[PDB]
Write a structure and sequence with these properties.
By secondary structure, the chain is α/β, with parallel strands linked by helices. The chain contains 6 helices and 7 strands; from the N terminus they run ββαβααββαβαβα. It has one domain: Leucine Aminopeptidase, subunit E, domain 1 (3-Layer(aba) Sandwich). Helix 4 packs across helix 5. It binds adenosine-5-diphosphoribose. It catalyses: Thiol-dependent hydrolysis of ester, thioester, amide, peptide and isopeptide bonds formed by the C-terminal Gly of ubiquitin (a 76-residue protein attached to proteins as an intracellular targeting signal).
């Protein structure tokens, strides 16, 4: 049978949102998901954070394909997305651009970002904008839970952040 989208060890937060303390790259190898989400910039230049880890795991294939896409089509809009190959990690990678709060981009665009998730049944995803782009992780989670109606399995790398998110959620 197909052991595709074989998620295990997630906490169910809502009907359609699950969360786990895991490296999204390790989850990708284990699950072989249809879609993995990248927390991208508009240039798909995969730096630190999730983007760099995903790219490193593809031996730079993601960056080469991303360079090609951007050469052809130009940059994404903040809040926008594109579907590219998941290479050796997944069938597809949904590249989504959260607002860069560190450069004072409108936090409103984080709702636009998560809206992209609704075009896909099942996603393995991180918290958009909550790392290098300097949004409050609890805010990213709230906007995710409030916006996404499809099945999202969130991977949080940092144990302490995972614990703060889960406690903060289960108080309301
Ligand atoms: N390997 C990982 N697995 C799971 N979660 C991770 C991982 N690495 C980081 N995280 C967490 O995922 C969330 C997203 O952080 P970033 O990946 O930095 O995303 P973002 O804030 O949107 O920054 C995007 C920017 O950073 C670059 O990676 C990217 O090219 C873009 O310029 C944060 O909570 C971060 O701690």
């Amino acid at each position: 049978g197909h052991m595709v989208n074989s998620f295990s060890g997630y906490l169910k937060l809502t009907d359609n949102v699950y969360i786990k303390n895991a490296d999204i790259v390790e989850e990708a190898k284990k699950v072989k998901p249809t879609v993995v989400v990248n927390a991208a910039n508009v240039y798909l230049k995969h730096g630190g954070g999730v983007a760099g880890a995903l790219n490193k795991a593809t031996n730079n294939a993601m960056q080469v394909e991303s360079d090609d896409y951007i050469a052809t089509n130009g940059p994404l809009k903040v809040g926008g997305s594109c579907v590219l190959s998941g290479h050796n990690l997944a069938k597809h990678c949904l590249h989504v651009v959260g607002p860069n709060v560190n450069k004072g981009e409108d936090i409103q665009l984080l709702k636009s970002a998560y809206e992209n998730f609704n075009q896909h049944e099942v996603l393995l995803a991180p918290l958009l904008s909550a790392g290098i782009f300097g949004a409050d992780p609890i805010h990213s989670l709230r906007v995710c839970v409030d916006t996404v109606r499809t099945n999202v399995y969130l991977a949080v790398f940092d144990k302490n952040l995972y614990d703060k998110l889960v406690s903060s959620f289960l108080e309301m």
